[PDB]
Structure formats: C-alpha cells, structure tokens
Amino acid sequence: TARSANTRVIRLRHNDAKTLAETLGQISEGMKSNILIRADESTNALVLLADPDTVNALEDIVRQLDVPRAQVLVEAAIVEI
Amino acid sequence: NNAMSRAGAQVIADARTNRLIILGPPQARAKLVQLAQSLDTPTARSANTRVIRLRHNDAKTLAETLGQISEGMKSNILIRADESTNALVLLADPDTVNALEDIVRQLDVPRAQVLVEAAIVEI
Amino acid sequence: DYSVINLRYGWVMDAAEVLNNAMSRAGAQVIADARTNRLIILGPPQARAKLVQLAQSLDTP
Amino acid sequence: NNAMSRAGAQVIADARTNRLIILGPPQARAKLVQLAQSLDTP
Amino acid sequence: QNVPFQTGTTVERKDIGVSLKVTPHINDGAALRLEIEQEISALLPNAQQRNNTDLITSKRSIKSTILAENGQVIVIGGLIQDD
Numbered sequence: 386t387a388r389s390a391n392t393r394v395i396r397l398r399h400n401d402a403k404t405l406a407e408t409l410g411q412i413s414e415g416m417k418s419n420i421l422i423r424a425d426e427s428t429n430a431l432v433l434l435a436d437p438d439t440v441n442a443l444e445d446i447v448r449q450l451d452v453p454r455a456q457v458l459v460e461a462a463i464v465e466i
Numbered sequence: 467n468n469a470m471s472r473a474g475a476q477v478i479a480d481a482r483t484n485r486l487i488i489l490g491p492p493q494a495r496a497k498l499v500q501l502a503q504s505l506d507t508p509t510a511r512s513a514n515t516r517v518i519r520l521r522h523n524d525a526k527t528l529a530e531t532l533g534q535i536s537e538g539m540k541s542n543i544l545i546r547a548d549e550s551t552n553a554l555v556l557l558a559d560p561d562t563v564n565a566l567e568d569i570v571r572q573l574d575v576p577r578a579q580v581l582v583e584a585a586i587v588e589i
Numbered sequence: 590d591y592s593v594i595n596l597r598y599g600w601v602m603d604a605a606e607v608l609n610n611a612m613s614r615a616g617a618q619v620i621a622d623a624r625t626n627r628l629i630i631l632g633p634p635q636a637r638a639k640l641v642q643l644a645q646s647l648d649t650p
Numbered sequence: 651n652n653a654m655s656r657a658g659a660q661v662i663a664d665a666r667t668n669r670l671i672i673l674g675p676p677q678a679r680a681k682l683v684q685l686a687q688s689l690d691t692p
Numbered sequence: 693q694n695v696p697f698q699t700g701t702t703v704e705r706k707d708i709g710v711s712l713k714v715t716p717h718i719n720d721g722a723a724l725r726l727e728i729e730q731e732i733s734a735l736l737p738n739a740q741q742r743n744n745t746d747l748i749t750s751k752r753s754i755k756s757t758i759l760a761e762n763g764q765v766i767v768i769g770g771l772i773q774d775d
Contacts, residue, residue: 509625
C-alpha cells in the first residue's frame with residue numbers, strides 16, 4: 386500500500402541541480418510526512434520524494450524556475466575627430 | 467481514544483498499512499467512517515506557496531531583509547532566494563502573501579540616471 | 590450532539606484552548622485537526638451555532 | 651478575573667482576534683464595555 | 693597586440709588595443725542594465741623618452757554603468773577639447 390512508489394525524477398533546463406536543490410531543501414520545511422529533494426550534477430537532474438500534493442507543488446516551483454534566459458547584442462561605437 | 471467519554475470501545479492503529487481496527491458501537495463506526503471519508507480529503511497547508519520574479523534588485527539581498535522582518539508576520543513563514551533567475555520563493559498564508567507582495571511592489575523600482583557634464587575653463 | 594465543521598482562515602490550534610474553556614469548570618468536547626483544519630465538537634446545539642458564527646467572524650482577516 | 655471578588659462569573663480571552671467572552675452579570679458587562687470603550691483609547 | 697612592461701627587470705604581459713567588456717542585467721521587457729567597461733588603447737613610436745615603451749594603454753577608457761532601452765542609440769560619453 387502507501388509510502389511505496391511515491392518518488393519522482395526531474396530533468397532540469399537552464400539551471401544546475403545542486404544550486405536549486407539547496408533552495409528547495411530550504412523551502413521544503415514548510416511543505417512537511419517526509420520530504421526529500423536531492424541532486425545530481427552529472428545529468429543535471431533532481432530526485433524528489435514526496436506525497437503527490439507536494440510533488441505537484443514542487444513541479445509548480447520547477448516549471449517557473451527553468452526558463453531560457455535572454456541575450457543582448459551590444460554594439461558600442463567610438464567616433465573621434 | 468477520546469471519542470468515547472471518560473472507556474468501553476477500543477481503537478487500534480496500523481501506521482504501516484494505514485489500517486484501523488475499532489471495537490465498539492455501530493453508529494460510531496458509521497459516523498467515523500464518514501469522518502474518515504471527509505478526513506482523507508486534502509485541505510489547508512497545501513498549495514499555499516508563491517514564486518516572485520524580481521526587477522532591479524538581487525534576490526538574496528532582499529531575502530535577508532524579508533527574513534529579518536518576517537518574524538513579526540508569524541503559523542509559519544518561509545522566504546528563500548535564488549540568485550540564478552533572481553527569484554524569490556515565498557511560503558505563507560495568503561494575508562502574509564499579500565503583505566509581502568506589498569513589500570516587494572514598493573522595493574522594485576527602476577532607478578534614476580544622471581548625465582554629468584563637468585567643464586573646465588582656463589585662461 | 591456531534592458535528593464537524595470547516596474553517597476558511599481560522600485555526601483550530603488557537604481555538605482549541607478557547608473551546609475547551611467555552612464550557613465552565615466539562616461536559617461537551619472539542620477535537621482539532623490542524624492538517625485539514627477541521628473541528629469536531631460534541632455538545633449543545635447553541636454552542637455549535639454561536640461558535641460557528643464566531644468561526645465565520647473568526648476566519649476574517 | 652479579579653473583577654469579581656474572592657469566583658462566579660468568567661472571562662475568556664482571544665489574543666489573535668482580540669475577542670472577549672464574558673459569562674456573568676449584565677451590569678458588569680455594560681460597565682466593562684464602557685471601560686473597554688474608555689480602555690481602547692490611546 | 694600584447695606587450696611586456698617592466699615592473700622593475702621583472703616584466704609582465706599586458707593587452708593593448710580595442711577592447712570591450714559588457715555585463716548586462718535583463719528585465720523581462722524593456723530597460724536593460726549595462727555595466728560597460730570599454731577602452732581603446734594604442735602604442736606610440738613618436739614621442740619616446742629615455743625610458744621604455746610609452747604605451748598609450750588608455751586613450752579612451754570609459755568604465756560606466758548605464759541603463760538603456762533595447763532599440764535606442766544612446767550616448768555614453770564624450771570629450772570636446774579645444775585649444
């Protein structure tokens with residue numbers, strides 16, 4: 386029955402796994418009957434272990450923290466007469 | 467155990483297989499199976515979180531200040547930061563969420579620029 | 590009689606010490622659920638009605 | 651609690667919602683609601 | 693070019709020529725922030741003293757921090773020197 390197959394594996398885009406993992410571990414006290422978010426820097430992935438409400442909440446965190454960032458082309462110009 | 471007044475009936479828990487063995491009247495059985503069916507429904511302290519993007523400010527710099535003011539908004543309160551996407555993770559009751567939104571909307575402004583022209587004349 | 594009610598913003602943690610002393614020094618009883626914010630009260634119907642009204646005034650910010 | 655001499659009537663506080671539940675005579679109710687209205691003045 | 697310069701003889705390598713170092717900070721929308729460190733060096737063969745390379749290592753060197761709009765040709769700096 387329960388506390389069995391209640392785990393999750395999350396790939397990450399545009400973010401490191403351990404960097405977000407410290408922040409999710411520091412916010413996951415308020416989602417606590419057990420909560421475990423650990424990282425993997427090899428395939429940049431994130432291992433979740435939580436009840437499915439907490440799983441959906443952490444998916445809402447992750448889907449709003451993994452965005453493609455923006456680029457700037459800077460053209461500086463110097464004129465001297 | 468305190469469902470019957472000060473015992474008579476009995477109650478036995480199974481926290482591995484989540485089972486309940488109750489030894490008593492049939493109406494307490496029926497009404498508390500109904501309270502079980504209302505009791506295994508999700509309710510509060512669930513989906514009471516928030517993610518805030520920041521403009522013109524770092525996340526950790528404001529996060530120390532919000533963590534140092536958030537003792538007075540305290541039944542739990544959690545503001546942590548992210549310097550990658552400059553964002554701020556809030557966990558609070560919705561009144562405290564609106565109060566911290568009032569803090570954030572008055573601390574993220576575009577700052578002002580000066581063009582300075584110094585001039586030196588010598589004869 | 591027995592009943593169970595919800596709370597929108599009210600806390601059964603704070604209201605437990607209230608409702609235990611709602612009856613003088615016990616008779617009626619009161620049971621809190623701080624996970625699902627439920628209140629199971631076992632007593633007179635007027636205390637039920639007046640304290641559901643205090644709950645509806647109590648879950649106001 | 652010491653408004654009645656050494657109890658009879660009772661008094662119950664709510665420090666979250668600032669409520670007062672008093673169980674006693676109506677004149678203590680009226681005079682102490684008036685002391686409340688003088689008491690919540692700065 | 694990349695030239696040596698004496699710090700004693702205990703010489704050291706140092707870069708000479710057009711250079712640019714940008715660091716942006718990007719809002720979701722308009723009004724980007726820029727931290728510019730632009731420079732133009734040169735090297736001088738004409739006015740040589742009794743000493744080493746008179747390296748014009750800054751001829752312009754504007755190290756500023758501005759806040760611009762994403763299609764707007766703006767002016768960062770200037771010099772008008774009359775004599």
